[PDB]
Design a protein around this ligand. Structure first.
Ligand code: GDP
Lengths: 339, 337, 55
């Protein structure tokens, strides 16, 4: 009898899924590649290592630029957070972590704060205003902390291996809004420019758009054949790109509620650790497990370049707000600023 | 290019400090505790502190006094709850009053408080023949292995001046989601032991973070064999861990734990519960070895990797001390060059 | 199984009722944004080697 009611609910779910698939197909009159055909390709633009940041003793699992397009932070499993001056390569701060296992780091837009987290299942907030000491420790995630991003100094959104994201009130130190409905580990998150929305990558091979204020999933994006390790918003906030273990990058549109484009190349089989757009959004940068970082044309779906500075897989990427510099980080313990 | 040199000087100060931390970090042996919940991982970490460090002094034990009370209460409560499911009546009908008063007094504090009133209630319940009959059926529901340990010692624990012994502290049960790290020195060697604790996720994503750690201590509870299958569930996990590509150069150490329970339990519950194809006699020695074979056969690397197996009781400071001495030797022998 | 099966069905309904725009319009808007800020992109536009901090 319980099965009979479950059979109904299954059949209804199937019907609804078919409707969405059919509604999305009705939406496609044309494709992104078709409409951009007259657009002159980027070509091949060669970049170079303009800076090499040394002093990390282990794998670098994450990094985040400052909003001033100068300072940046990095998280290594050596048990250290390091704030760098990218111009002079001077180490501004070295922050000892109570847990040497750290999978992410973030830099507050005000520049007053920095966050990090990992297998300790905690997002730790460090105050940068002599030396640096921790301000807040936000607990309650039962899974590992994969990613975190500041809305402002009082608000941060985190994602975890317990399949949930969260909105935190840092002042109270309490979780404000909990985001549920992912069936797998959430590897990454990205806020919309206006911080009205944010998207999440996960091990369920799906990306999900969440409402920050009302605390709900709006849309769900699929088509990836493996885990989504990275996610990033297109500058206008109407689109986002996803990196994955299926070796592919996928551009999704919010209004169209579907996949616009796949960025992948035969002979590229390795997983993708990180993604970032350029300032205009024309260029999509992706960190790979093959030690490289490939530069894709977002509109033309062609590779505009390649970056190999690293002897180990590239774990993370970043692009300055001014779009002047590209930062890579890796398991080879080194950071490289490209221009 | 003058006044900004002061910043460069601070960078070099930082740069040297990283070098200093890095030198000392390289001489530290990194151990990784794995295995299912309640396998004894938290117990062993405590033993490392007990054996190779100062251990637990009076003040350290006093911190655990609250947890001792909590574990005791949570134990007797679990039995009472099971009495309903198994249709087991109280020996004395008046014990239903204590059972209610228990749940009421269990509500008085979110921490473990212990007063004469609560002690009398738990004691009278524990002595009751109905509760004892439900206890003997504990293989049919979730219950602490330290349950009878605390409840039989209740008269001592209920004391006003009571302080926890080191055995009391070892027996306590606590669940932490966050990874637990500890440091100690043995034979001039520095150790970092890592317990993932309760990490709720798909292990595939965080497993590579531990690539290159010296050895893995995988804890398995022998007594889980007759419980609903927890043993077969452990084998699946170990099958994944031992044969993992990330652990190739990592020494795989296998602890078969709670051997004290298993030896007594095998007198009643047959191994055929867990392994129906088992045609052997039910004896502590044969059955324990059989289980060992089941876990070791899971190795697909047999020509390359070796599984170092031990039969351990983790509450026994002496037995752990002896076995860890063998663990130390394996690390030295297996990795040196 | 769990009664959460109903919640998913309801979520699918929320997934189901939404405003959906034709791709070509969404695609044009992305092109429009790119071309608008194309001159402002330092990776696309080779900013003078004099002014860039890394030289
Ligand atoms: N009877 C008995 N109990 C044990 C033994 N080893 C550990 N325990 C107890 O069993 C429980 C489970 O141990 P725990 O440290 O919590 O394991 P973990 O969940 O994997 O971290 C603890 O309460 C220990 O006190 C043993 O050899 N015999």
């Amino acid at each position: 009898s319980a099965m009979s009611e479950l059979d109904q609910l299954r059949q209804e779910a199937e019907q609804l899924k078919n409707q969405i698939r059919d509604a999305r197909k009705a939406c496609a009159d044309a494709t992104l590649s078709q409409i951009t055909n007259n657009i002159d390709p980027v070509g091949r633009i060669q970049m170079r290592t303009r800076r090499t940041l040394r002093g990390h003793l282990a794998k670098i699992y994450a990094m985040h630029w400052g909003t001033d397009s100068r300072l940046l932070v990095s998280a290594s499993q050596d048990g250290k957070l390091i704030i760098w001056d990218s111009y002079t390569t001077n180490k501004v701060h070295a922050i000892p972590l109570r847990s040497s296992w750290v999978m992410t780091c973030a830099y507050a837009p005000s520049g007053n704060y920095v966050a990090c987290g990992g297998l300790d299942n905690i997002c730790s907030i460090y105050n940068l205003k002599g030396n640096v000491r921790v301000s807040r420790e936000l607990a309650g995630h039962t899974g590992y902390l994969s990613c975190c991003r500041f809305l402002d100094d009082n608000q941060i959104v985190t994602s975890s291996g317990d399949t949930t994201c969260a909105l935190w009130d840092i002042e109270t130190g309490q979780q404000t809004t909990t985001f549920t409905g992912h069936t797998g580990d959430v590897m990454s998150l990205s806020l919309a420019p206006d911080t009205r929305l944010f998207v999440s990558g996960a091990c369920d091979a799906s990306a999900k758009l969440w409402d920050v204020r009302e605390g709900m999933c709006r849309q769900t994006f699929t088509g990836h054949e493996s885990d989504i390790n990275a996610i990033c918003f297109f500058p206008n906030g109407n689109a986002f790109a996803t990196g994955s273990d299926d070796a592919t990058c996928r551009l999704f549109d919010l209004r169209a509620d579907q996949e616009l484009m796949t960025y992948s190349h035969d002979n590229i089989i390795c997983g993708i650790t990180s993604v970032s757009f350029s300032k205009s959004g024309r260029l999509l940068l992706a960190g790979y497990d093959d030690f490289n970082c490939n530069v894709w044309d977002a509109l033309k779906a062609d590779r505009a370049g390649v970056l190999a500075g690293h002897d180990n897989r590239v774990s993370c990427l970043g692009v300055t707000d001014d779009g002047m510099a590209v930062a890579t980080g890796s398991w080879d313990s080194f950071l490289k600023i490209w221009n | 290019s003058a006044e900004d040199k002061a910043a460069v000087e601070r960078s070099k100060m930082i740069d040297r400090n990283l070098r200093e931390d890095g030198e000392k970090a390289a001489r530290e042996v990194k151990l990784l505790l794995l295995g299912a919940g309640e396998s004894g991982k938290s117990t062993i970490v405590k033993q490392m502190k007990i054996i190779h460090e100062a251990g637990y002094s009076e003040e350290e034990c006093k911190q655990y006094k609250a947890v001792v009370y909590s574990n005791t209460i949570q134990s007797i409560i679990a039995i009472i709850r099971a009495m309903g499911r198994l249709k087991i009546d109280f020996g004395d009908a008046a014990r239903a009053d204590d059972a209610r008063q228990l749940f009421v007094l269990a509500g008085a504090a979110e921490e473990g408080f212990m007063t004469a009133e609560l002690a009398g209630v738990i004691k009278r319940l524990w002595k009751d023949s109905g509760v004892q009959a439900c206890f003997n059926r504990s293989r049919e529901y979730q219950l602490n292995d330290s349950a009878a340990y605390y409840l039989n010692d209740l008269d001592r624990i209920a004391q006003p001046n009571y302080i926890p012994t080191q055995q009391d502290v070892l027996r306590t049960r606590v669940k932490t989601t966050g990874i637990v790290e500890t440091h100690f020195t043995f034979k001039d060697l520095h150790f970092k032991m890592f317990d993932v604790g309760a990490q709720r996720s798909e292990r595939k994503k965080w497993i590579h973070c531990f690539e290159g750690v010296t050895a893995i201590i995988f804890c398995v509870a022998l007594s889980d064999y007759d419980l609903v299958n927890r043993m077969h569930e452990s084998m699946k996990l170990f099958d994944s861990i031992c044969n993992n590509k990330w652990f190739t150069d990592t020494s795989i150490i296998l602890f078969l734990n709670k051997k004290d329970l298993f030896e007594e339990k095998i007198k009643k519950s047959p191994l055929t519960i867990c392994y129906p194809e088992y045609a052997g006699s039910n004896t502590y020695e044969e059955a324990a070895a059989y289980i060992q074979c089941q876990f070791e056969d899971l190795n697909k690397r047999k020509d390359t990797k070796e599984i170092y197996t031990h039969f351990t009781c983790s509450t026994d400071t002496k037995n752990v001390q002896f076995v860890f001495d063998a663990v130390t030797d394996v690390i030295i022998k297996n990795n040196l060059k | 199984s769990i009664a959460q099966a109903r919640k998913l069905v309801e979520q699918l309904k929320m997934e189901a009722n939404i405003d959906r725009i034709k791709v070509s319009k969404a695609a044009a808007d992305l092109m429009a944004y790119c071309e608008a800020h194309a001159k402002e992109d330092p990776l696309l536009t080779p900013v003078p080697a004099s002014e860039n901090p890394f030289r």
